[PDB]
Structure 1
Amino acid sequence: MNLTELKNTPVSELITLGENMGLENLARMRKQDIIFAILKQHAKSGEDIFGDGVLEILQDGFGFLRSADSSYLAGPDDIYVSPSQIRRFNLRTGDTISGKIRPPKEGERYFALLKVNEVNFDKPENARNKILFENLTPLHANSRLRMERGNGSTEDLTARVLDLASLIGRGQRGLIVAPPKAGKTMLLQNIAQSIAYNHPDCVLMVLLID
């Protein structure tokens, strides 16, 4: 089946479903190994298996496919991608790929990508004739990105202050300088909640380091 749903499921029911349909011991190893084993056995059963994620090209033009749920770990469940598919479907680095996948055979140990059904959420042939990001000409921020929820929340005050403090728009390059113990993380919480509420169409990404 589609590995995304089972990957998003917590470990307890993953273990119980591994054990209830013909597995020996799954409790005492990592989640990635559990997913790899259950995918291998389900593929040996014979049903179709689906995968999706983000493509990474190594230094030799050789492709892995990672999952955003695992925060792009180099887990055993990463999808094999040969350079032939990269050159034939003509992808980039960081594309979003979804399609049927192939169980590994002798000589390899990651699941291979059989066929692609969607690249960056549109038709695969439509991806080839796409314009590069660097070729795009930049501009200034035009569309206002309001940071007011409008629900009259008690904490919404903070977000309201942001609207009174600085103007944020699409394409804006923003910096928040602050010493430790100043509320940066929950200010980011408020910003993310405001983006999710007021603007549910724009893609929201929250990146954390160390």
Structure 2
Amino acid sequence: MNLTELKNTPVSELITLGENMGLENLARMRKQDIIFAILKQHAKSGEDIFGDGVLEILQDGFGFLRSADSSYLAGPDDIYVSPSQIRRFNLRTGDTISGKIRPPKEGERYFALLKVNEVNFDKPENARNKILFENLTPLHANSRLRMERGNGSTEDLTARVLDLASLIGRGQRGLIVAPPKAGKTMLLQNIAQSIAYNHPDCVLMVLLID
């Protein structure tokens, strides 16, 4: 079973699954605590349990592994990562790690990982021999990122005006200088929808602050 599969489930499932596994009062506490309790209960049975997420390196190799759907929130369900396998696999911050996870021992309250079977959606040996980002030589934008959806949507006029106004391509560095109450949120929403529709290959990330 997948920890990510648990985290993608809604909150009410704690009644359906947590109570069915013998837990007593998972109704009243924070969701990550419910996830921790259910996955501890399942781990006590002994079946193999999967895990995955984005790696974080602390100031002293006290590595952690967070989940994307939880907005990388520091919670009990975070996966511990000792410096030993960090050195062995030459890992660093931002690495997507997937594989086995281990139930915590005495004195530990975080689920460590037994062995990784996927790094950055690739084999660990293929991920190890990859050069650093900053060593890559930049260039100007070459491939055009057309925002015209082409589905004839009633809101597609925004994307069309965007295409006529400012061309967007791979590798640009863009700014949207707007006042409050101007339409930034749904302009970015239309941009994201057009990117998801026209260009399913490129990885799309949206980041929201305060």
TM-score by length of 1: 0.99
Over residues 21-76 of structure 1, what are the superposed CA-to-partner deviations in whole Å (9 max), with x where a residue is unaligned? 21111010000000000111100110001000001010111100000010001000
Give the Å deviation of 1:130.
0.3
Q: Distance in 2 between matches of 1:15 and 1:91?
A: 38
Q: Is the 8 A contact 2:14 2:26 kept in 1?
A: no
Which residues of structure 2 form unaligned runs of 5+? Answer: none
Q: Deviations over 1:85-142 (max 9, x none)?
A: 1001111211000001000010110001100010000111111110110000000000
- Report what 1:4 is aligned to: 4
Is contact 1:6-1:14 (8 Å) kept? no
Q: 1:15 deviation in Å? A: 2.9
Q: CA deviation at 1:14?
A: 2.9
* Whole-angstrom CA distance in 1 between matches of 2:90 and 2:174: 34
CA distance in 2 between counterparts of 1:3 and 1:62 reads 21
Contact 2:14/2:27, CA 8 A, preserved across alignment? no
How many residues align? The count is: 210
SS at match of 1:69: coil
Q: Distance in 2 between matches of 1:170 and 1:22?
A: 52
SS of the residue 2:172 aligns to: coil
Contact residue 56 and residue 65 of structure 1 kept, 8 A: yes
User: Percent of aligned pairs with the same residue?
Assistant: 100
Contact 2:101 2:114 in 1 (8 A): yes
- Match in the other structure for 2:67: 67
Listed as ranges, the matches of 1:10-29 within 5 Å are 10-29=10-29
> Are 2:171 and 1:159 equivalent residues in the alignment?
no
- State how far apart, in whole Å, the 2-side matches of 1:77 and 1:13 are: 17
Q: Match of 1:97, SS?
A: strand
Q: Under a length normalisation based on structure 2, what TM-score does the superposition of the two structures give?
A: 0.99
In the alignment, the residues of structure 2 paired with residue 169 and residue 187 of structure 1 have an alpha-carbon distance, to the nearest angstrom, of 17
Q: Hey, what's the Cα distance between the residues in 1 that align with 2:104 and 2:82?
A: 13
| Structure 1 unpaired stretches of 5+ | none
CA distance in 1, matches of 2:44, 2:92: 31
Query: C-alpha root-mean-square deviation of aligned residues, in Å?
Result: 0.6
